Amino acid sequence: TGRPEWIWLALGTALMGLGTLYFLVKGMGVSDPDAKKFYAITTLVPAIAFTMYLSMLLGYGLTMVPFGGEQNPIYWARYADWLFTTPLLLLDLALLVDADQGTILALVGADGIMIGTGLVGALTKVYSYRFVWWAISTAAMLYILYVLFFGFSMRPEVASTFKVLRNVTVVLWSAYPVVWLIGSEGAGIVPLNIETLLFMVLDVSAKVGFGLILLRSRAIFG
Amino acid sequence: TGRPEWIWLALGTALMGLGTLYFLVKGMGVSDPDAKKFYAITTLVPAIAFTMYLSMLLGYGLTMVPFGGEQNPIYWARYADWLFTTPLLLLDLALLVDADQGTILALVGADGIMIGTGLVGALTKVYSYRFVWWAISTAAMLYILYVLFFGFSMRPEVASTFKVLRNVTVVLWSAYPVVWLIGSEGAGIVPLNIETLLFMVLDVSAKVGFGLILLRSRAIFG
Amino acid sequence: TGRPEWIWLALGTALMGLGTLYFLVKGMGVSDPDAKKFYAITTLVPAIAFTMYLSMLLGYGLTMVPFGGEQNPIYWARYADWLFTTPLLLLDLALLVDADQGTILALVGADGIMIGTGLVGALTKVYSYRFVWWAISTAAMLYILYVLFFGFSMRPEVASTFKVLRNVTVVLWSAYPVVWLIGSEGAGIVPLNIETLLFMVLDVSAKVGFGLILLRSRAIFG
Ligand SMILES: CC(C)CCCCCCCCCCCC[C@@H](C)CCCCCCCC(C)C
Numbered sequence: 122t123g124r125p126e127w128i129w130l131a132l133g134t135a136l137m138g139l140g141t142l143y144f145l146v147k148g149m150g151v152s153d154p155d156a157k158k159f160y161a162i163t164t165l166v167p168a169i170a171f172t173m174y175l176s177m178l179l180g181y182g183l184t185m186v187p188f189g190g191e192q193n194p195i196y197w198a199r200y201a202d203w204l205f206t207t208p209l210l211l212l213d214l215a216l217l218v219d220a221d222q223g224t225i226l227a228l229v230g231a232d233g234i235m236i237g238t239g240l241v242g243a244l245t246k247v248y249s250y251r252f253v254w255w256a257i258s259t260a261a262m263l264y265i266l267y268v269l270f271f272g273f274s275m276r277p278e279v280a281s282t283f284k285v286l287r288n289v290t291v292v293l294w295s296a297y298p299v300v301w302l303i304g305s306e307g308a309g310i311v312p313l314n315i316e317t318l319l320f321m322v323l324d325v326s327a328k329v330g331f332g333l334i335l336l337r338s339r340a341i342f343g
Numbered sequence: 344t345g346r347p348e349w350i351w352l353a354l355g356t357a358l359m360g361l362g363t364l365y366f367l368v369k370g371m372g373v374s375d376p377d378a379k380k381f382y383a384i385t386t387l388v389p390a391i392a393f394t395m396y397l398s399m400l401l402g403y404g405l406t407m408v409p410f411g412g413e414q415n416p417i418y419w420a421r422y423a424d425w426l427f428t429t430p431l432l433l434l435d436l437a438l439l440v441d442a443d444q445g446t447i448l449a450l451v452g453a454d455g456i457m458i459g460t461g462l463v464g465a466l467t468k469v470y471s472y473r474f475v476w477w478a479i480s481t482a483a484m485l486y487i488l489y490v491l492f493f494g495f496s497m498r499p500e501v502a503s504t505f506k507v508l509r510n511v512t513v514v515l516w517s518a519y520p521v522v523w524l525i526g527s528e529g530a531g532i533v534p535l536n537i538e539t540l541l542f543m544v545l546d547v548s549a550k551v552g553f554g555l556i557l558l559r560s561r562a563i564f565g
Numbered sequence: 566t567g568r569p570e571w572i573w574l575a576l577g578t579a580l581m582g583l584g585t586l587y588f589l590v591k592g593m594g595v596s597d598p599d600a601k602k603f604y605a606i607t608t609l610v611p612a613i614a615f616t617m618y619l620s621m622l623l624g625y626g627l628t629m630v631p632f633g634g635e636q637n638p639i640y641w642a643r644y645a646d647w648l649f650t651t652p653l654l655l656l657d658l659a660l661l662v663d664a665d666q667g668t669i670l671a672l673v674g675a676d677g678i679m680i681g682t683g684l685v686g687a688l689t690k691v692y693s694y695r696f697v698w699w700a701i702s703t704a705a706m707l708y709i710l711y712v713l714f715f716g717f718s719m720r721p722e723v724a725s726t727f728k729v730l731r732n733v734t735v736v737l738w739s740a741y742p743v744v745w746l747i748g749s750e751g752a753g754i755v756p757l758n759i760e761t762l763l764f765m766v767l768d769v770s771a772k773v774g775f776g777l778i779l780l781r782s783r784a785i786f787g
């Protein structure tokens with residue numbers, strides 16, 4: 122369509138769709154109930170992203186937010202996606218290391234705060250206050266990363282895969298608040314079409330890439 | 344009120360209300376914790392439907408969607424209802440057969456996708472794209488029905504009741520995408536008042552009827 | 566700002582923020598997984614309230630509802646807060662007494678109905694119908710309080726702390742439907758600035774006060 126960012130929404134839609142089908146076919150047959158959990162969690166994340174990318178591509182997951190003088194296009198469906206997919210990613214990690222439920226509740230809740238305050242930030246019409254919401258969101262992110270590194274006798278297989286996925290998690294997740302801040306939601310330093318491209322590369326990496334690492338690991342079997 | 348479909352919203356409200364009270368009285372006394380789960384899940388479904396039918400009856404759960412040239416009345420509160428009640432129905436099934444958590448997560452998540460894409464479809468202003476959302480929603484439905492039939496040593500009591508409720512589930516759930524497609528949300532072949540009547544009969548059957556079958560079964564006791 | 570109720574939103578924001586930091590520091594070190602659950606649940610409640618108070622203070626969590634002839638300011642973010650924080654409060658209670666899952670599902674679901682019908686009531690433009698939603702909401706509240714008193718060999722420590730928190734719960738929770746009914750959401754007998762002050766005192770008491778009682782108890786350790 123008109124919107125130049127359309128091609129990145131179309132590619133994202135396609136890549137999430139293909140990833141969903143791949144993981145779906147891949148988990149056919151699996152009977153190990155622990156493996157089943159990782160396959161469910163891990164197939165569901167790009168299925169949800171597929172629907173949210175498609176909603177952006179079709180125009181449904183877009184709204185206009187007045188701020189800094191103008192009508193800023195804001196892809197709210199990114200935050201619907203993340204609201205459900207980032208806790209499932211953290212569940213994949215938590216399950217791997219057999220986390221305490223209290224620890225899982227702290228992570229899912231901090232994550233909810235992260236995404237929800239990010240969405241408030243994205244929809245806030247008072248420009249300076251958008252960055253107050255960003256800061257709080259970023260503090261929840263930093264709580265989550267802290268817990269992943271200082272909050273957790275696993276089998277050596279779990280440990281190696283967990284350490285890989287944890288490091289993937291820190292580099293990819295930490296990029297999101299930077300893209301937001303320099304993109305059209307924040308300081309407007311990078312244009313929306315480039316902003317959309319960067320979140321597309323992160324999304325596919327953090328969903329389909331992450332899942333490929335994890336579903337190839339023997340850490341997922343009991 | 345003016346809206347001819349009001350009588351079906353009023354009857355639905357009444358039938359869900361009476362069903363809620365019946366199951367509520369019925370489960371008084373029960374102490375078998377397994378039975379308690381089935382009674383909770385099963386009383387909660389028509390209590391939620393009661394509130395959503397009433398919201399439609401009062402006009403709150405209605406909005407107007409422009410598409411195909413006109414202002415189409417869309418009862419969004421149907422999708423709020425279903426968003427919470429269809430996973431609880433699937434939980435009743437999953438519990439009955441002592442499903443793996445991975446299997447339950449796949450079902451609840453596919454269900455979320457089903458209802459959420461149905462709601463996007465219902466609110467989409469570009470007429471052809473409403474049916475893309477319908478198709479995806481229907482594919483999630485077909486995943487869920489597949490799992491119920493090819494994804495599951497139960498006691499013979501569980502097996503007989505599960506088989507009954509599973510067959511109820513397939514016939515009733517499969518009717519919903521057809522009603523949507525022929526009703527005012529889709530091709531507009533059947534008028535809104537008839538559409539509302541058909542979803543009312545399905546809703547009461549799939550909630551109050553289903554629950555009556557299940558709560559009469561000894562399959563629910565440990 | 567202009568709104569006289571701002572000072573109560575500012576104090577609430579501050580008190581929830583300080584409470585969040587206090588519980589956060591307080592739970593550093595804890596390793597007893599049961600204690601961890603109570604600390605997570607209990608730190609998360611004022612963290613969420615902090616964000617929702619701040620959203621009200623900044624103006625984001627406010628909307629205007631036409632009814633009784635006028636444009637009534639309605640702080641919808643109170644209901645987002647409560648939607649997540651009241652089930653976590655009930656979880657703290659349920660965990661304490663080692664409730665049956667069926668009993669926990671009945672409580673969380675009745676609670677969802679309570680808050681959701683309260684939000685419908687708050688946003689309903691037909692004045693008489695606001696009180697139909699209030700009545701249903703209040704009936705869900707009374708179900709929840711019934712269960713807390715007639716639905717539950719605990720260690721004597723659990724019993725004493727549970728009995729304290731249960732009595733706190735009844736007096737504080739029962740005040741909310743009264744404030745709503747006499748405040749600007751309901752009969753408009755008490756002005757919005759006083760209404761906001763009363764919910765602020767209840768909120769801080771029911772979150773930060775409650776949590777202080779509970780986290781000081783040895784009932785939370787295995
Ligand atoms: C290993 C196989 C079978 C995977 C392919 C399934 C689905 C689609 C491609 C997903 C691959 C991506 C790897 C994750 C990491 C990222 C940094 C990818 C970002 C995009 C790069 C574009 C180059 C080609 C692609 C179409 C993958």
Ligand SMILES: CC(C)CCCCCCCCCCCC[C@@H](C)CCCCCCCC(C)C
Nearest residue numbers: 358359361362365544547548549551552553555
């Ligand atoms: C078995 C008893 C005690 C049940 C009655 C409790 C609550 C209300 C009626 C619910 C009954 C419905 C059976 C489920 C199946 C359906 C196909 C019903 C659709 C509607 C039919 C209208 C005929 C009468 C009714 C008012 C039930």
Ligand SMILES: CC(C)CCCCCCCCCCCC[C@@H](C)CCCCCCCC(C)C
Nearest residue numbers: 580581583584587766769770771773774775777
């Ligand atoms: C015990 C300690 C360390 C607590 C302080 C941490 C956080 C802030 C204050 C929370 C205290 C409140 C007690 C709960 C009960 C309520 C009825 C309080 C309502 C407000 C009263 C105003 C008086 C002073 C306050 C700022 C606490």
Ligand SMILES: *C/C=C(C)/C=C/C=C(C)/C=C/C1=C(C)CCCC1(C)C
Nearest residue numbers: 239255258259262294297298301327
């Ligand atoms: C599937 C996509 C994933 C893993 C997305 C992760 C998104 C985040 C970590 C977002 C973080 C943000 C902040 C920390 C600051 C405010 C803006 C956000 C929401 C982009």
Ligand SMILES: *C/C=C(C)/C=C/C=C(C)/C=C/C1=C(C)CCCC1(C)C
Nearest residue numbers: 461477480481484516519520523549
């Ligand atoms: C309590 C009500 C129940 C059991 C409702 C079930 C609803 C569905 C199975 C809806 C399905 C739909 C599709 C498959 C296609 C798009 C439209 C929907 C949402 C009606």
Ligand SMILES: *C/C=C(C)/C=C/C=C(C)/C=C/C1=C(C)CCCC1(C)C
Nearest residue numbers: 683699702703706738741742745771
């Ligand atoms: C953290 C805040 C808490 C514990 C808030 C509790 C809120 C309630 C118990 C609200 C109850 C209401 C009703 C019973 C009637 C309708 C209005 C409400 C939502 C205020």
